[PDB]
């Protein structure tokens, strides 16, 4: 789908796109390419969508944010209003209908355990539906590709 130079480039820039004033030149120096060809190549890979984004990816916890998984038993008659209150929240990034009495499961991220609970309490006050706040206290091993 691309040449070995592009695979070398990606291998470098998935670990780390360089922090220097002329990053393409640093990459060009390392790859045996002129600066403009490395930009041309990055721009082509982005436009073929093999590069989805070029930028920062943050570790939530280190920015002071906490995350949780929430669950509710949502009667058919409250489903629409519940789902809208949940999806309205910018810190809800996943929301799923699932096959169980606890049929609505969503993640919620915020700056603090207290802010998260106030969000959940507001949802329940708007919909009459109680919510279980289920934060993880232990993680056993996590991978991505």
Position among 26, 29, 65, 66 found at the interface with another protein (CB under 8 A): 65
Rounded to whole angstroms, how far apart are CA atoms 23 and 78? 53
* Segment contacting another protein by CB under 8 A, of 55-63, 112-120, 121-129: 55-63
Tokens describing residue 121: 């309490």
For the window 92-121, what string marks contact with another protein as x by the rule CB under 8 A? xxxxxxxxxxx-xxx--x------------
Chain center to CA of 20: 26
The contacts of residue 9 (CB under 8 Å, 6+ apart) are: 27, 31, 38, 41, 42
Tokens describing residue 67: 């995350």
Task: Determine if 137 is a binding residue for another protein (CB under 8 A).
Answer: yes
Binding stretches for another protein (CB under 8 A) = 10, 13-17, 19-25, 35-36, 39, 42-43, 49-60, 62-65, 69, 71, 83, 86-87, 90-102, 104-106, 109, 132, 134-145
């Amino acid at each position: 789908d691309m040449d070995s130079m592009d695979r070398q480039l990606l291998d470098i820039i998935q670990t780390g796109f360089p922090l220097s004033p002329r990053p393409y030149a640093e990459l060009g120096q390392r790859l045996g390419l002129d600066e403009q060809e490395v930009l041309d190549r990055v721009r082509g890979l982005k436009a073929r969508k093999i590069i989805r984004r070029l930028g920062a990816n943050f570790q939530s916890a280190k920015l002071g944010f906490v995350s949780t998984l929430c669950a509710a038993k949502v009667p058919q008659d409250k489903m629409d209003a519940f789902v809208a209150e949940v999806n309205a929240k910018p810190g809800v990034t996943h929301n799923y209908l699932r096959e169980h009495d606890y049929n609505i499961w969503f993640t919620l991220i915020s700056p603090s355990r207290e802010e998260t609970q106030a969000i959940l309490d507001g949802i329940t006050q708007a919909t009459g539906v109680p919510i279980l706040n289920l934060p993880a206290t232990k993680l056993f091993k996590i991978r991505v590709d």
